[PDB]
Design an enzyme around this catalytic site. Structure first.
Site, PDB file in Angstrom:
ATOM      1  N   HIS A  51       0.833  -1.204   0.000  1.00 28.42           N
ATOM      2  CA  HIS A  51       0.000   0.000   0.000  1.00 28.42           C
ATOM      3  C   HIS A  51       0.871   1.259   0.000  1.00 28.42           C
ATOM      4  CE1 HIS A  51      -3.456  -2.514   0.822  1.00 28.42           C
ATOM      5  NE2 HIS A  51      -2.942  -2.936   1.964  1.00 28.42           N
ATOM      6  N   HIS A  74       2.508   8.899   0.502  1.00 24.12           N
ATOM      7  CA  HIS A  74       1.391   8.785  -0.431  1.00 24.12           C
ATOM      8  C   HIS A  74       1.780   9.630  -1.637  1.00 24.12           C
ATOM      9  CE1 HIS A  74      -1.329   7.076   2.636  1.00 24.12           C
ATOM     10  NE2 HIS A  74      -0.695   7.884   3.467  1.00 24.12           N
ATOM     11  N   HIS A 110       3.676  10.922   6.206  1.00 25.08           N
ATOM     12  CA  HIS A 110       2.963  10.769   7.466  1.00 25.08           C
ATOM     13  C   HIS A 110       3.858  10.122   8.503  1.00 25.08           C
ATOM     14  CE1 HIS A 110      -1.198  10.770   5.300  1.00 25.08           C
ATOM     15  NE2 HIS A 110      -0.746  11.989   5.537  1.00 25.08           N
ATOM     16  N   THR A 141      -6.445   7.319   7.170  1.00 29.27           N
ATOM     17  CA  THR A 141      -6.883   7.481   5.784  1.00 29.27           C
ATOM     18  C   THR A 141      -6.905   6.168   5.010  1.00 29.27           C
ATOM     19  OG1 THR A 141      -4.673   7.935   4.899  1.00 29.27           O
ATOM     20  CG2 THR A 141      -5.924   9.809   5.765  1.00 29.27           C
TER      21      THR A 141
HETATM   22  C1  AZM Z   1       0.184   3.285  11.374  1.00 32.97           C
HETATM   23  C2  AZM Z   1      -0.684   2.105  10.977  1.00 32.97           C
HETATM   24  O1  AZM Z   1      -0.462   1.022  11.523  1.00 32.97           O
HETATM   25  N1  AZM Z   1      -1.655   2.344  10.013  1.00 32.97           N
HETATM   26  C3  AZM Z   1      -1.975   3.521   9.402  1.00 32.97           C
HETATM   27  N2  AZM Z   1      -2.928   3.398   8.539  1.00 32.97           N
HETATM   28  N3  AZM Z   1      -3.213   4.597   7.946  1.00 32.97           N
HETATM   29  C4  AZM Z   1      -2.436   5.514   8.433  1.00 32.97           C
HETATM   30  S1  AZM Z   1      -2.534   7.197   7.886  1.00 32.97           S
HETATM   31  N4  AZM Z   1      -2.402   7.102   6.304  1.00 32.97           N
HETATM   32  O2  AZM Z   1      -3.783   7.773   8.381  1.00 32.97           O
HETATM   33  O3  AZM Z   1      -1.400   7.919   8.465  1.00 32.97           O
HETATM   34  S2  AZM Z   1      -1.309   5.055   9.620  1.00 32.97           S
HETATM   35 ZN    ZN Z   2      -0.730   7.934   5.517  1.00 34.05          ZN
END
Ligand code: AZM
Ligand code: ZN
Ligand code: AZM
Ligand code: ZN
Lengths: 260, 259
Positions: B63, B90, B114, B195
């Site tokens: 991902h 991302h 992030h 997200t």
């Molecule tokens: C940190 C974890 O285990 N999962 C996450 N899933 N989405 C994330 S986000 N894109 O909101 O930062 S962090």
């Molecule tokens: Zn993220």
């Protein structure tokens, strides 16, 4: 049942309406990277748009928007097949965030958006049957921004206080629908998409005009405050606001324009 | 789940209820929902200077590309202490290089970083904190194309080592603060969600106002170096457009530490 907010909101439409999670979804953001000029995109011709003032057309609050029924005798000329009108309706935001158009340009929303829906009358008998079939629909989108008072749009808005609640109807004398179109209609964005509301069928040929029309602050506020998605006899009324779908991913594709 | 296809974002709610729930991220940071707040003081990033003598795990999870972070690094300045767990990115694609998650005044940025943290005062670890009240805090850095960034290259230089899903590599410790933009005191703050599935509405977001810059070459490498498929898969799929569309955010519940 579906809505634009809450448990049955847009992120959940795909549960009951598979196409909402499928291909060719609308609306989309129109920005430079995915736009391309196509000199073959000629001007559309609007026929039968000057509705007789001696005829009445049904305005209805269907709980999702305010719609005006249109006669099949008004149609678009210029596409591979003839498309006849079925209805027009709008999408808007709310008083605190008056930016509720569906399509966006360079990431920017417009105050509201008008959709004039047509169906392929050369292949299908009506909009209902055409909606889930190949090249079944063609929608014209007019971007709306706040500005000068618009007498033509008021031919619709002056009836808003009479269709305040779900299911209510009113009659609008015919007027020239072309008056709702912006300047230089020869300039537009074109792409294959879908209905922006459930069932989200990917059967719509979209034409979004380049230039927006203007309506006054008062007209926009009326549109954003006069309607409720609930019946009149409902102890807990729910305002019809923010009735637009978020833009969808648009990858590996191009939107063609009739302007450079 | 994926970012495209029948298992794409519009279908996440079918399996992950919270993705169709309230407080969903990302959002468009625009005037209509913003509100200046003087109580939003500067955050302190402690333990961010990772030992160059220690190795940290970089992983392609199908991902995104993520780097595991030690719980000794944390954010200071918030109500509770939030300890780091990982960072990831991302991005978009070469033909449309605008793949940040959050937008500013409707504008996407090239990419977004992030740095995920969990409330270590209330919870024992990130996993336990994920679906609980005040459980997570994520720092978001907007990325745009510009001058070469030596600090971000401390990560990008290892990308081919995690080209395919499931692959892992080691990255020598470096000062993670080097990945933050100028004037970190200026940021947007709001309560939102993860997200990606399960999309739990347990994230306190801090999106720095100013973006960082990475070269066109660095951005291209990021957009073309990874696949979401396993090594030697018969139908290789490139990891691109791995960002969620912006979510509606009605009320003016986005605060800024700047006027
Ligand atoms: C940190 C974890 O285990 N999962 C996450 N899933 N989405 C994330 S986000 N894109 O909101 O930062 S962090
Ligand atoms: Zn993220
Ligand atoms: C007219 C009709 O049959 N239904 C429609 N549903 N959504 C439509 S839209 N917002 O894509 O123009 S038209
Ligand atoms: Zn519509």
């Amino acid at each position: 049942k579906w809505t634009y907010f809450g448990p049955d909101g847009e992120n959940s439409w795909s549960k009951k309406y598979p196409s909402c999670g499928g291909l060719l979804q609308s609306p989309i953001d129109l920005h430079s990277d995915i736009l391309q000029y196509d000199a073959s995109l000629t001007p559309l011709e609007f026929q039968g748009y000057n509705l007789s003032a001696n005829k009445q057309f049904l305005l209805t609050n269907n709980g999702h928007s305010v719609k005006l029924n249109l006669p099949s005798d008004m149609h678009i000329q210029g596409l591979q097949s003839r498309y006849s009108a079925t209805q027009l309706h709008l999408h808007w935001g709310n008083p605190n965030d008056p930016h509720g158009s569906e399509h966006t340009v360079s990431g920017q929303h417009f105050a509201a958006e008008l959709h004039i829906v047509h169906y392929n009358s050369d292949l299908y008998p009506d909009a209902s049957t055409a909606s889930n079939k190949s090249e079944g629909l063609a929608v014209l989108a007019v971007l709306i921004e706040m500005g000068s008072f618009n007498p033509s749009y008021d031919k619709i808005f002056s009836h808003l206080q009479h269709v305040k609640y779900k299911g209510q109807e009113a009659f609008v004398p015919g007027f020239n629908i072309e008056e709702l179109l912006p300047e230089r209609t020869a300039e537009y964005y074109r792409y294959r998409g879908s209905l922006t509301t459930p069932p989200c069928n990917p059967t719509v040929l979209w034409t979004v005009f380049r230039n927006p029309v203007q309506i006054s602050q008062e007209q926009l506020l009326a549109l954003e405050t006069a309607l409720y998605c609930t019946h009149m006899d409902d102890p807990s009324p729910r305002e019809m606001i923010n009735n637009f779908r978020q833009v969808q991913k648009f990858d590996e594709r191009l939107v063609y324009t009739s302007f450079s």
